[model samples]
Structure formats: structure tokens, C-alpha cells
Target: GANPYARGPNPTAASLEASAGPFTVRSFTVSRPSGYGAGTVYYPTNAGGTVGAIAIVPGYTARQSSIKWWGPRLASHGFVVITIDTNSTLDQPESRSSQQMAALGQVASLNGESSSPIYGKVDTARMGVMGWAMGGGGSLISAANNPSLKAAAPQAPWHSSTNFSSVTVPTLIFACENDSIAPVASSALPIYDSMSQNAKQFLEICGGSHSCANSGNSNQALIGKKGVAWMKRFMDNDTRYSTFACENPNSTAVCDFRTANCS
Candidate 1:
């Protein structure tokens, strides 16, 4: 466990060349999506589709360097995790969130087709994305609007979508003990209640820690594990998809009124 207080991933996760001689991380840069600015990509040795692929969008003001801790953990779980950092912090578009996801799709396309802008290392079909903070908000907007995203997990998410009516994909919302920005208003409840199409899940965390989800520690590990479960369901199109979508009774039986329910 490195410094959880730090916003980005620790140097240990970033610096590791390989856990052993067999599994080493490979990194490179590509043309970042239109509005995301430009940057390099870093991840573990891609198993192509043998393991799987996932795209991780960092919280606002967070860099690819910050969320590096998740790369290895994802790879260990048989996934090719893509860590993306657009610009410094303010380079993202304000209202045009949908386009950002389109760019992500393009990135996935590039990774999937061997003839993309770069050598396609990420499996575009088997894909899931997890975003925190503003990125979390963007994840909501993406999974709701875009059909390409396999699944999504948004942590401490804020409002971005106008109507839950448009959302028809399996999604997970990670709420804090009462996050400062998004504290579960009436509209939020109704939005949760009306997920008409695909499955849904909620995690009303006891600690309202805004940046805790990607800090790469025990809590972040739990978040990642839970996220992996949801993706496993949706991305793989497995029957457990139903179990994870409705499986709110986590260890210790912590079901409550706020938990995403039989709806």
C-alpha cells in the first residue's frame, strides 16, 4: 500500500517493469481522441482477447500516472486495462460529454483492429470503463448515450445526463457516504428507479471520501473487485450478469433502502 493520500498511483505500480520475467507491462502513445488532447497509453502486456480489455477514465484533475495502480490489478484479473489522461485537468469539454465517449470508442477501435493508428493491443469487444468524479459523471453520460460501451462503474458520480430515459445499458453507481457534490437528491432516486433497459447496481458507501475510489488501497481494491464483478457479468454476457446486477447483499448483508433494488 503506497500513499493513499496521493491523488495518483504510487511509483511502485508505475515503475514496475514486470512482476516476473513472463508478464511485463508495455506502454506507448497514440493520437488521443479529438477533445481529450494527446497523451501516451500504459498497460500490462495485452493478452489481446485471451484475457480481456478495459478502459479506465480517471477523475478530474487526475492523470494517467495517478491511476497507474489499477493497471496491474486489472491485468492480474485477465484484462488489458487502458489508463488514459487527456490533458492537464481543464482540457475536457464541458457540455459535450457524449463526444468524449465516442472518442473512447475510437480508441477501442484502434486497439481492436490491428490496422488502427497504432498496434491494437486492447480488445474492443470485451470492454468496460470505470470513471471517478467528473470522469465518473462522464461515464454515466457515455454508457447512457453510447451503445458501444459494454458496462460502466461511476464512483462518487455527479449529474451529467438530462434524462435517465435515454439510459439503457448495465451500469453501476458508486456513491460515497454522502459525497459533497452528489448527495442523492430526488432526481437521482427517480433516475435509479427508472433504469428501463439493462441491469443496474448501486454502492452507497459509508465513507463519503471523494477521491478514495482510485487511491489504490484496500477501499480502492474493493471498488475494483466489485467493478470487475459487474464487468464480468456484462462484458462476458454471462448469466451472473443478473446476479451481480441485482446482488446488492454484499458481505455482511448490508442491504438498505438506498441500495439499488428489485427495479
Candidate 2:
């Protein structure tokens, strides 16, 4: 394959499921936030070349801690990742969407900053987004607003609107089967059903709660592989990740799965 963006060794189930990817990761704190609150940026020191960037936001009433694990997890997989805190912990999905994009914007800025550790390490043209709960819903909103976003994968997303048929960016929704706060039937499922265009997938964690896909979840082996594979397949246009991104896990840990336009 002639993929210039492809980084690290060819992926395997064991490789993607590991706690970390092939690259050595490093981090730095955002001293001045633009539209969002605070943020911590993580990037791979030797990804072999520049890589796409990804921004992650936490759910309503949650801080960066809820989604911070994604920072190292994704950065090590060859992406410059920023996990952020919203201006206010209780901000709605719309506000979260704005903050999520803002965080991505800062990542682009950092890529060009000579003093930044991740300087020239990010390919700003290719980017992705993820979040938990309301922030997850924000990821969808981000995709709807910015079709240029390469991919989106939100976990247990919650939002007031379920009609996201406007989104064209490839998306992967991680659902918690037993979520009581934002039931999969009303939230994630309808949101997934509304998207008629673009590649998409839905994965429901068996007997999982609202935080099943968030930080500290026990199923990182499967969840991490899917998340990284989704971004790699779309954001980097790396077809080596196709099967990992779209295949059915057939594991008891997954209670439900669906996909469309993923070939």
C-alpha cells in the first residue's frame, strides 16, 4: 500500500488491544485555552512522520479525567490527541461541540508552534473527535458541522436531538447496554439510525453502564481496538485497519453490533 499516513507496524488483535500502541508517547498541558477550559495534549515522539489529530471531550458534569485515558491510548497509536475540560462542567451538548472543535483548533495551532513539543507533528487536515455522554453527542454535532472531520466515535452519547442524518463523517457509536441515564434505545440507537450517509457502526457493551466506554472501563481490549481502528481507517485512510474497524467481535462482551457503508 502507498499510504503515507500509515504509522507503526501492521496491526493485530493483540497489538490494538494492548494497553498502548507501538509509539512512545509524551504529553504537555495547554497553558492558554481558547474556547474550551483546560486541556492536556499527548503525541507520539516517533510516529515515523506527522499524524492526524484527535480531540476528546468529557460528558456533562464530568472533567477531563473521564476521558483522559484516550490521550495516551490514541497518541501512542500515531495521533496527536487532546483531552479537554469544558468551560463549565454542566455545559450542554451544543456547547460541548463548540469546545471540542476549539480544542482541535488549538491542536492545529500547536502543530505550527515552534516551541510546542508536538510542533510539526500533526497533519491538521486530518482530524477526529470523541467524547463521553453529552460530549459524545457533541462529537456527532461536530461531525455534522464539520464534514471535514475524518472520523467520530462517541461513547454512551447523550443529547436532546436524535436526528443526526445531516452528519456525513464516518462515525462509530459505543453504547452501554444497561444505561439508565441515556438509554441506548432512545439515545445512541436513534442517533445511529438517523445517520443515513457515511460509514457508521454501533457496538453495545454487554450489561454495561453509562460509563462502560469511558475511562477506566474494563473492556479496553475490545473498545480500544475499535476506537483506534476507526480513526486509523478513516482519519489516516489506512485500509489495513478495515477489518478491525468493521468486523463483528462475536464476543460475549458485546451484546449488539451493527454497521453500514463500512466496506
Candidate 3:
């Protein structure tokens, strides 16, 4: 596996705001693709071979813009990232999960479609999912219900319940310390506590708002580093990215953190 997450002066992992990686980023649109909603695919220009993919959904009442930054951010680090617009902006967790999976399905199909730019650049076998708010909760549902997903990273996730004890895929949760929207205690923490069966991490941004890990955070470098590392380690099955996922580089910046079953 390629060490795409490596960058910066220290170079332990890649940063979000830093210039693109070894590959150039390119985008193209796919309309009304099967069960998935309309979306765009951001892929690396030269990964040399197939790369892992991750599908992302926006929060309630939010469109692709709410999470589009993730597309280039991840794709630059050796991932085929797809950000979608749901059938309805107000879709709940279950609906978001379906759309997210459908988008993943579409990406897998592109790998075989001769007309697609990413025709043979996607490794469907190594996949991941992520989202914000309700969409973030849906990401948990997707990971819990589908073992094929190698990793899950949810930002300020919200859900109606905390019954995802069945999730086995490695997970990383980016939480807002003072979030009024999702209320960390009732939303993110419980969902994390329930998942006692796999490698998991909870990174709470100290004094972060509900949109802490979204595009505008001052800590995007740190957050992006960990996000890419988790995907690199689990999705690509590369042990070189393990430190970024398993070890904490700084504590004062991150309010609190936890991890389990890391290999």
C-alpha cells in the first residue's frame, strides 16, 4: 500500500490544507446513478494502481457543499472520495445510509465502466464511510450493518438510538466538545460506548462547535491527518499509518481521547 498520508515538516501524516500529494486531483459528475443520489467523484490523477474509496453524506437539511471539502482532501491522500446530495435534504439516518451505500455501489461500477475516467483506478474491496450530524449517525449504521466497510469516521454524529454494539469495522469519531446540536453525551459518546467489539477512537476537539471537524476548523490539519491515517491503516491494510490512528500526538489541543483493539 502507498503511504499517501505522509507529509508536512514532521511528516508523520498528511495535512488537509497542505498542497496535494504525489497525485493530482480531478473531478467528474455522475448523474442519477441507480439507487444513489447525484454526486461527484474526486480521484487522484496518478495513484499508479487501484485505490480505496470512501462515500460521504451530508447532515440533515444539508447538501454536498456541507461535506464536499472531504472529497479532494481524501482523494489527494490516495482515496476515491465521493460526496453526495441525498434524495431529500431532510433525510434521516436510515435514508442517508441507503444513499451512502448506493454511492459506493456507483463508485464500484465505475471501476468497470469503460467510459469512466476512474475505470480501473478504484479498489472496491477497500471501502469506507463518513458523514456529519444525522448523516454521521447513518455512517455508523452502515458500518455496523456492513462488514465489508473497512473504516468509519463520523463528525458530530447524531442518532435516535445507541444500539450499534454490532459494529466491528475500525471507527474514528470527530466530536465537538461543546456541541449543542448533537450533544456529545447523548449522541457520540453513547454510540461509541456501544461498539465494544472492534478498533475504535473518539477524538473530541476541545471547545469545538457542532461543526468542529467540518471544513472551517483551525485544527483541520490534525483532524485530516488522523482521518487519512485511519483510512490508510484499515482501508488499505497498511501498518505504516498505525501511529496516527493509535497514538495521540497532542492532548491539550484534543480535549479527550480513547481507543481499543488496535492491531
Candidate 4:
């Protein structure tokens, strides 16, 4: 019911703006809402002007460039993306800007930024966040406070607090059972068991290490396919797949789960 489990590409909103199958996309970004600073945006080339969007929160030590590969791919899937770099290290104050972010073109008071393709045309109501590592930790806290945050997908995520008594967002967790970054004992299990919704999806890529899950290898690609599909189902709001169940909820793999049909 509650709690769970969670990808990458160009740091653009191209996921919805570009061409998803036969439709092209059109994306944009927002200013640092009345509370925070300004950032970037990207749209799918086929978009008619407005489309779904996701807030991309990168992990600690990982830069926007290190995670850019995710943007274009998401654009290809039909989504306007808000790619944000919450400057991993302490000095950069603009990093955590994700906190101030919301809807797309609605941002009219932007301050400074190099260049953001997403400047106008996102539907905030359907927005979500996809973070990694420490960023994975960030989104958990964000979702806890903002129910407007429909879903969250964190790669190699770790636990941030013990208060799951409030969160209800549909979370997608990507677990590397043997990840050196997010150890199963210290981070994975605790975070996975904390949510309070049945819309989440928990996936474990067996035999993978931290970096291995990101690699373009055969195993990683296959598992990555699962990741892509999960996001589409959660973010795109699609139900082509029977992504529902009483025991395991939105989960896909059955053999490893302790839910009813699983185990």
C-alpha cells in the first residue's frame, strides 16, 4: 500500500515536448516562484505548447552535465522537464532551487541563469521529481511537505528521516541491492517502508553495484527499460500495464517481493 521503490538523459523537458511516438513536443520553464531563485526548462519538439513536466533533482557530486543524458530521453518520451542542479556541495546556494520551483511559464520573476530551454509551458499540477543519491534524499523530504508533488523517483535512494506519518506521494525507488552508495541496510529498506500510498513502485536490480546500474550494458539496459516503463506509468498516468495489485501495489517484479502473489 504505502512505501516503495525507482533513470537519466539530457537535462531537458524534452520528455514531453519532443516526439513521443508520433506526436512532437513543446516545453518550457519557470522562474524561482515568489520564494526562490530562477532555473531552466526544455520542451518536446512536437508539443503544442503545454505538456507534463518533472523536476530533475540531481545527486550530490553529480552535475547537470553528468545527468544531461536523461533530459533528451525524457523529451523523447513526451514530457517537459525542469532540470535543476541543487549544487551538491555547500557553497552554491542556487542548488536547492528545486524548493522554489513550480509550474512552467508561471515563473515570471526569474533572476539569473545561463540558459534554460524550459521557460514557459509546463503544467505544474502534474509535476513530479526525479533525484539521485543525496538528491534522492531531497525529494523524499520535498514530497513529504508538498502533496502537489504527485510522484518521485529516486535512484540509489537513502532514508532522510523516520517520520513517514505524513508522506502520501507515489514514489518510485530504484534499488541496487548491493549498491555501495545506498546500502540495503542503512538506506534502502528504511526509505522503502516509509511511504503511505499504493501508487508507488519498488524495483531491485539484482547483481548490480552502484555504478553498474547506470552503465549502458545489457543487464543495465534491460533493467533501465523497466525504469523507463515505471516512470511512464507513474508520471504519464498510463495504465496500459496492469500496474496495480493488492499485495505489491504498482510493482512489476514478483519473485523477490514479499507481497501476496510475490513470495
Best by lDDT: 2
lDDT tens string, model 4, 1-263? 42111112222222323323234444443445333233345556654544466666555565455344455556555566656644334312123424424423233222123354544444445666666666566666667767776566666665455344476776766666677877855775567776555456566666556643342423433334444454555554544322331124223332233221110
Query: What TM-score would every model get versus the actual structure?
Result: 0.70, 0.99, 0.93, 0.67
Tens digits of per-residue lDDT for model 2, 131-232: 999999999999999999999999999889999999999999999999998999999999999999999999999999999987899999999999999999
* Candidate 3 segments whose C-alpha is farther than 4 A from its true place: 1-19
In terms of TM-score, which candidate is strongest? 2
Give the higher-TM-score candidate: 1 or 2. 2
Number of colliding residue pairs in each model: 3, 0, 0, 52
Model 4: CA > 4 A from native: 1-40, 88-120, 162-165, 212-220, 241-263
Q: Model 3: per-residue lDDT, tens digit, 1-263?
A: 44553332233553433645456799998855667567989998877668988999989888888788788888887889989888899889999999999999999999999999899989888899999999999999999889889999989999899878999999999898999999889999998899989899999999988888776677867788788878878997777677777887575779879888876
**Candidates in descending TM-score order:** 2, 3, 1, 4
Candidate 4 accuracy as TM-score: 0.67
What local lDDT score does residue 99 receive in model 3, on the 0 to 100 scale? 91
What TM-score, to 2 decimals, does candidate 1 have?
0.70
* Alpha-carbon local distance difference test for all models: 0.54, 0.95, 0.85, 0.50
On residues 29-106, what C-alpha lDDT tens digit does candidate 1 reach at each position? Answer: 655465454434445453333434565666666776556666655554445565666545653323324434544566
Give the range where candidate 2 is weakest over 10 consecutive residues by summed lDDT.
1-10
In model 1, residue pairs whose N, Cα or C atoms come closer than 3 Å (at least 3 residues apart or on different chains), thus clashing, are 8-66, 9-66, 177-208
Which 10 consecutive residues of model 3 have the lowest summed lDDT? 5-14
